[PDB]
Design a protein around this ligand. Structure first.
Ligand SMILES: Nc1nc2c(ncn2[C@@H]2O[C@H](COP(=O)(O)OP(=O)(O)OP(=O)(O)O)[C@@H](O)[C@H]2O)c(=O)[nH]1
Ligand SMILES: Nc1ncnc2c1ncn2[C@@H]1O[C@H](COP(=O)(O)OP(=O)(O)CP(=O)(O)O)[C@@H](O)[C@H]1O
Ligand SMILES: Nc1nc2c(ncn2[C@@H]2O[C@H](COP(=O)(O)OP(=O)(O)O)[C@@H](O)[C@H]2O)c(=O)[nH]1
Ligand SMILES: [Ca+2]
Ligand SMILES: [Ca+2]
Ligand SMILES: [Ca+2]
Ligand SMILES: [Mg+2]
Ligand SMILES: [Mg+2]
Ligand SMILES: [Mg+2]
Lengths: 352, 438, 421, 54
């Protein structure tokens, strides 16, 4: 009989994993402060890693990798890419980004302006986007003065990265979108990619001559369902799954989702996770870690995939909770604590 | 030459002291009767090993050590054991009943009655020193004597020997080998009152020594003898520079200088490699790079924690055996390019290295195999603050209900000394965070 | 040299105490005449803890036999190991206590208490370093209950800083001599709440059910009940008699000064299929099973503040840790989570006479409040009607003293109740 | 990657490698603490004996 504790009541994913664990009749939930546990569905912020793996005779497993915040933070991800030889500063799949501290606080203010002046002089498209982790607060603009003045009015670190002025637009609609991939990394650091993804689409026609109205530029599920007037028109909940999106790429572009996009996604997922493996691996540690990741991608009119951000505590598509949460238990939890297919994941083999 | 007086307090300090001095004798060629054939200056000399041994006219080499315990069964082993001849009786001090795992009982009730006697025996050792460096104090966190009487001894040592350095070898409490529920109380009480009096302290987590013994030595259920022999190798590595000819860590003052930039943060992390089972058919001898890289593996640290998520303030590499500087730097370069070694911006990113050509000695019939080269890394990581967190949390669970507190109040301790001590540890945890986190 | 002075008072106290000295005297190789005849030095290692060494290598128990009537102690003097006790250590009267706590505590017992303390003082003075005292007695009678608690009170006055430990047989209507037992037990519990560091609660109802349902004894006797108490007393004291400290034990078992009433357990308990070997999992499953416990309290009705186990015999110490850490990690809902690592395990290589390996269980559980609740209920059922009070008021006691004992025990239950939540 | 302060002798050598440059209570007061706790023990035992005498 295995024991687990829940320390994040707001986790829709592990609320299901926890519900499934109890359904097996071989997992017993304990009070969130009971140390004699096998599995910890820990909190997002300030998870007490230093207290794991010190109970005699208990193999302990936690659903977060200590150190993965380096990847799941706007500014952190930028510094990781620019300072990591595995990713280098010439990383071809990550938009040119800069870390900018508000003037009321290293900082890349000047380095951003140099690249800006270069584009402005060369007649090139010079539209950037400013954002931060403390957002629901985003600003898209082509003037550098507006971008920097918007970050000073705030008080937290921000990031300015190039705005993809040529995004691939679905038809009919002429509308932006993004791709959400779910990636599970187990205690052995095997990288499993959920076969099911979701395209969070914009129900508004993309308009390059008006970044003021951010409902056709931002494909967030909350913004489309709150400030967009065509929500749920083309697909239910502004969500298109891989089957529909794949068939579209064949009828329209004469290509497949695997060849034109998924190869680059799998490559980007591997590159990011292999990079930090030495820093976060629990291979020789006194406890084990796994974690579900939400990778967000952009696709341009050349079918080139770009990495937007990586979410360390992602949610799932309503239609995909059952299958994916079951997959977590199968490969992540029961692989360490077995019970008394055709997998839903795609193993991204790599060198450890 | 400057002398070092070792003090062993409580069962843990006495039995670890017994294991170290056994090893020192094997290392310096001293026999159980105290005789040292290689010592050509009979009844005197200022050699490096004389920092730990005085000499009688009869050529006996007497440890500059004091063993203190409130109950006599552990020291009586020393009095009748293999090395009973090394120490004369005045060096072995035992009461008739212990502190019952009660800090207040060892610090106040019993400690008050025996403190002046201990200081008198220590003064006798100090009177044989032409230039005393300081003291090395061995004790447990959890025992009532180890915690309670040790902290009182440190306070008095700071009075009687103000200009002398004091180093600790402290045994951190682990449930796998402890039967006492109150050790979190004792550990925090004694760390609070000892902090300002200790210049550098080497914590050994019994949980670490235990797994190293089960994993590397294949000891299914280790004993204190197994733990103590392994612990005395690390201690021998740390005190070798004081007992042998060298230039790194040649006196106690150099430990604080090289390992403690901030006085309160004086808890270096010890890592030792390799530990090889003697029962093995025969092991492939590891290289300088391999044993150096092992120094950044959590599995051979004296305290289980993740240095990859701390910051280094200092770092010493103490090699023993067939090692030359060429191999060391080759391994270090290779480790920087692979490992996660983040230093504080106000400290250089460097490694002080010491090499002693004599390979590690091992007690015959012991558990550790004879290896051609070994290294002990002393690094001051903020990652060791995990050990304070764990311990402080257990304290909080019991103190929230005042569990077992009446035992301390009953010996004359005020309840406020609990919160005063816990607040100090909370500050200690804040210091580690201000130093190692952005 | 950490000596323990043993005291047994009253019928129950001396009959249970007698068998205890019969059991451990067999374990230490001491024959009925005090001459050692074992074959292991471990038998003599800690022998002075309970035995004095006399001329001719004779070992004399450090026991003081007390009673207000001569009957029971005449049995001991004529029983198996009767000759091994010091003649001067028999202190007794002739009036008896009539199962009356007031007689043992204020009138009859009060006249006899000083001569007992002279014997205690004689034994303590000759101790190199006295650990503390241990008393065996019942709470439902007069001498062991009434005078026993009077002794504990006077011993704590003269030795305030010594550990006071008792084995106390709690009454039960099922195995009950007189109806006034609830009265005597309630009056004694208050004394024990104040003046003992550790009290092992032994419930005659539990000892009965074990002898009936588990041991398959059709008609249990007091002798059969005492065989279980002897086997338990030998188990809990194994840490003291072989290769630790009374005060150290108390420190790790007693988190609150008044909650020092333990539930002991023993394993195996086999019926005469008695030669079969008992694996470590079986020792552990039984040791924690309620049917193996002698407090007649269902531990699943409360929570363990602290638990101690002692395993005896040559067994797999690695497999011991695996099984103990299995009962904890498979029922941690019955252990308070605010005392980390409150389950301790000890091993001893010498098993009891006739067992390859055994396990003794010592638990500080809040389920023990069920025991004091039963006693409190029986007490109130009679006291509300003042039934049988004249036996006690006739000895100088006042109804006020009963009202206070009632409240004291109900406060004790309230205290147990708050830590169970 | 610089080596400095290389010291050599018969029984070993020591050096320093740099990979990157940077960016009490008096004796009286102790007696008081000890004697205060002893006074609190004496007071607590006086209350016990006073209780037992009652
Ligand atoms: N590594 C190691 N730890 C020990 C040894 N002896 C005791 N300990 C640890 O020390 C803690 C208990 O402290 P002790 O040293 O036994 O107690 P004490 O210092 O004698 O003080 P008292 O309470 O008076 O007995 C437990 O955590 C033990 O695991 C030993 O020989 N080696
Ligand atoms: N450089 C860029 N070029 C084009 N579009 C961008 C962009 N940066 C952000 N976006 C738009 O913003 C949306 C995602 O914003 P971002 O992920 O930075 O904020 P967020 O983290 O609060 C949303 P989530 O974490 O749920 O994916 C995408 O749908 C994308 O269309
Ligand atoms: N287990 C056990 N209980 C007993 C024995 N003798 C009496 N009792 C119990 O003890 C209580 C009676 O107390 P008793 O010792 O006879 O009175 P005392 O001699 O005046 O102290 C009743 O609850 C009895 O059930 C015995 O030999 N064994
Ligand atoms: Ca000499
Ligand atoms: Ca000082
Ligand atoms: Ca009379
Ligand atoms: Mg986000
Ligand atoms: Mg001790
Ligand atoms: Mg009777």
């Amino acid at each position: 009989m295995y024991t687990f504790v829940v320390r994040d009541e707001n986790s829709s994913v592990y609320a299901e994993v926890s519900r499934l664990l109890l359904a097996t009749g071989q997992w017993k939930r304990l009070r969130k402060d009971n140390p004699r546990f096998n599995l910890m569905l820990g909190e997002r912020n300030r998870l007490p890693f230093g207290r794991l793996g010190h109970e005699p005779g208990l193999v302990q497993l936690v659903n977060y990798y200590r150190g993965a915040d380096k990847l799941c933070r706007k500014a952190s991800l930028v510094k990781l890419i620019k300072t990591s030889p595995e990713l280098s500063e010439s990383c071809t799949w990550f938009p040119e980004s800069y870390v900018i501290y508000p003037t009321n606080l290293t900082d890349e203010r000047e380095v951003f302006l140099a690249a800006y002046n270069r584009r402005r002089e060369g007649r090139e498209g010079n539209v950037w986007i400013a954002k931060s982790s403390a957002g629901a607060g985003i600003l898209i603009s082509s003037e550098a003065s507006e971008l920097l003045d918007f970050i000073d009015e705030q008080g937290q670190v921000h990031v300015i990265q190039k705005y993809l002025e040529k995004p691939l637009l679905l038809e009919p609609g002429h509308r932006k979108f993004d791709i959400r991939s779910w990636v599970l990394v187990d205690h052995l650091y095997n990288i499993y990619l959920y076969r099911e993804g979701v395209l969070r689409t914009s129900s508004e026609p993309y308009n390059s001559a008006n970044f003021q109205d951010k409902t056709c530029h931002l494909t967030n599920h909350c913004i489309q369902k709150e400030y967009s007037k065509n929500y749920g028109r083309y697909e239910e909940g502004n969500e298109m799954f891989f089957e529909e999106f794949n068939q579209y790429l064949m009828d329209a572009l004469n290509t497949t989702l695997e060849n034109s996009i998924l190869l680059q996604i799998k490559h980007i997922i591997r590159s990011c996770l292999m990079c930090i493996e030495p820093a976060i691996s629990t291979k020789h540690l006194h406890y084990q870690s796994f974690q579900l990741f939400g990778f967000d991608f952009m696709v341009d009119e050349e079918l080139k995939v770009w990495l937007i951000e990586v979410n360390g505590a992602p949610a799932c598509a309503q239609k995909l909770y059952a299958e994916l949460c079951q997959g977590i238990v199968d490969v992540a939890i029961s692989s360490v604590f077995p019970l008394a297919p055709t997998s839903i994941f795609i193993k991204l083999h790599h060198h450890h | 030459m400057r002398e070092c007086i070792s003090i062993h307090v409580g069962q843990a300090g006495v039995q670890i002291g017994n294991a170290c001095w056994e090893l020192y004798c094997l290392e310096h060629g001293i026999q159980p009767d105290g005789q040292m054939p290689s010592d050509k200056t009979i009844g005197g000399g200022d050699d490096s090993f004389n920092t730990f041994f005085s000499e009688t006219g009869a050529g006996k080499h007497v440890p500059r050590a004091v063993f203190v315990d409130l109950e006599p069964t552990v020291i009586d082993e020393v009095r009748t054991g293999t090395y009973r001849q090394l120490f004369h009786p005045e060096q072995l001090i035992t009461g008739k009943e212990d502190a019952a795992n009660n800090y207040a009982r060892g610090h106040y009730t019993i400690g008050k009655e025996i403190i002046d006697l201990v200081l008198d025996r220590i003064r006798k050792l100090a009177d044989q020193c032409t230039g005393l460096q300081g003291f090395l104090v061995f004790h447990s966190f959890g025992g009532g004597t180890g915690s309670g009487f040790t902290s009182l001894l440190m306070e008095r040592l700071s009075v009687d020997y103000g200009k002398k350095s004091k180093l600790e070898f402290s045994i951190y409490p682990a449930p796998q080998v402890s039967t006492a529920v109150v050790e979190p109380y004792n550990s925090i009480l004694t760390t609070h009152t000892t902090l300002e009096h200790s210049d550098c302290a080497f914590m050994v987590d019994n949980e670490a020594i235990y797994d190293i013994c089960r994993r590397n030595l294949d000891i299914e259920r280790p004993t204190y003898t197994n733990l103590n022999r392994l612990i005395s190798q690390i201690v021998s590595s740390i005190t070798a520079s004081l007992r042998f000819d060298g230039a790194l860590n040649v006196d106690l003052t150099e430990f604080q200088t090289n390992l403690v930039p901030y006085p309160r943060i004086h808890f270096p992390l010890a890592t030792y490699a390799p530990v090889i089972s003697a029962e093995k058919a025969y092991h492939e001898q590891l290289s300088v790079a391999e044993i150096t890289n092992a120094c950044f593996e959590p599995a051979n640290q004296m305290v289980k924690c993740d240095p990859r998520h701390g910051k280094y303030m200092a770092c010493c590499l103490l090699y023993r055996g067939d090692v030359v500087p060429k191999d060391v730097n080759a391994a270090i370069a290779t480790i920087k390019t692979k490992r996660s070694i983040q230093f504080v911006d106000w400290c250089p990113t460097g490694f002080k290295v010491g090499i002693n050509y004599q390979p590690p000695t091992v007690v015959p019939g012991g558990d550790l195999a004879k290896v051609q080269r070994a290294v002990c890394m002393l690094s001051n990581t903020t990652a060791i603050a995990e050990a304070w967190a764990r311990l402080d949390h257990k304290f909080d669970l019991m103190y929230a209900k005042r569990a077992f507190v009446h035992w301390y109040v009953g010996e004359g301790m005020e309840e406020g000394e609990f919160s005063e001590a816990r607040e100090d540890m909370a500050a200690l945890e804040k210091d580690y965070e201000e130093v190692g986190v952005d | 040299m950490r000596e323990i002075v043993h005291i047994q008072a009253g019928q129950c106290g001396n009959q249970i105490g007698a068998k205890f000295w019969e059991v451990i005297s067999d374990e230490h190789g001491i024959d009925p005449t005090g001459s050692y005849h074992g074959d292991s030095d471990l038998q003599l290692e800690r022998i002075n803890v309970y035995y004095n060494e006399a001329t001719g290598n004779k070992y004399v128990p450090r026991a003081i036999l007390v009673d207000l009537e001569p009957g029971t102690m005449d049995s001991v003097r004529s029983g198996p190991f009767g000759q091994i006790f010091r003649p001067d250590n028999f202190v007794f009267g002739q009036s008896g206590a009539g199962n009356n706590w007031a007689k043992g505590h204020y009138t009859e017992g009060a006249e006899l208490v000083d001569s007992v303390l002279d014997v205690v003082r004689k034994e303590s003075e000759s101790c190199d370093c006295l650990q503390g005292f241990q008393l065996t007695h019942s709470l439902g009678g007069g001498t062991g209950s009434g005078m026993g608690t009077l002794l504990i009170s006077k011993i704590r006055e003269e030795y305030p800083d010594r550990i006071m430990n008792t084995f106390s047989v709690m009454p039960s209507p099922k195995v009950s001599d007189t109806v006034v037992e609830p009265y005597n037990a309630t009056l004694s519990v208050h004394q024990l709440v104040e003046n003992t560091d550790e009290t092992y609660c032994i419930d005659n109802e539990a000892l009965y059910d074990i002898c009936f349902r588990t041991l398959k004894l059709t008609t249990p006797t007091y002798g059969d009940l005492n065989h279980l108490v002897s086997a338990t007393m030998s188990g809990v004291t194994t840490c003291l008699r072989f290769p630790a400290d009374l005060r150290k034990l108390a420190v790790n078992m007693v988190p609150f000064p008044r909650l020092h009433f333990f539930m002991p357990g023993f394993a195996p308990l086999t019926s005469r299929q008695q030669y079969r070997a008992l694996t470590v999992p079986e020792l552990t499953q039984q040791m924690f099973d309620s049917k193996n416990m002698m407090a007649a309290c269902d531990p699943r009705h409360g929570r363990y503040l602290t638990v101690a186990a002692i395993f005896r015999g040559r067994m797999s110490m690695k497999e011991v840790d695996e099984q103990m850490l299995n009962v904890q990690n498979k029922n941690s809902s019955y252990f308070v989570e605010w005392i980390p690592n409150n389950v301790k395990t000890a091993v001893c290589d010498i098993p009891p006479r006739g067992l390859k390996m055994s396990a003794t269980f010592i638990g500080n559980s809040t389920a023990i409040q069920e025991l004091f609740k039963r006693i409190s209920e029986q007490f109130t059922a009679m006291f509300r009607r003042k039934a049988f009070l004249h036996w006690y008021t006739g000895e100088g006691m006042d109804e006020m003293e009963f009202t206070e004992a009632e409240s004291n025990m109900n406060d004790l239950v309230s205290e147990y109740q708050q830590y169970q939540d | 990657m610089e080596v400095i302060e290389l010291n050599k002798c018969t029984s070993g050598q020591s050096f320093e490698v740099i990979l990157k440059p940077p960016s009490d209570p008096s004796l009286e007061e102790i007696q008081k603490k000890l004697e205060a706790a002893e006074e609190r023990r004496k007071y607590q035992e006086a209350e016990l004996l006073k209780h037992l005498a009652e």
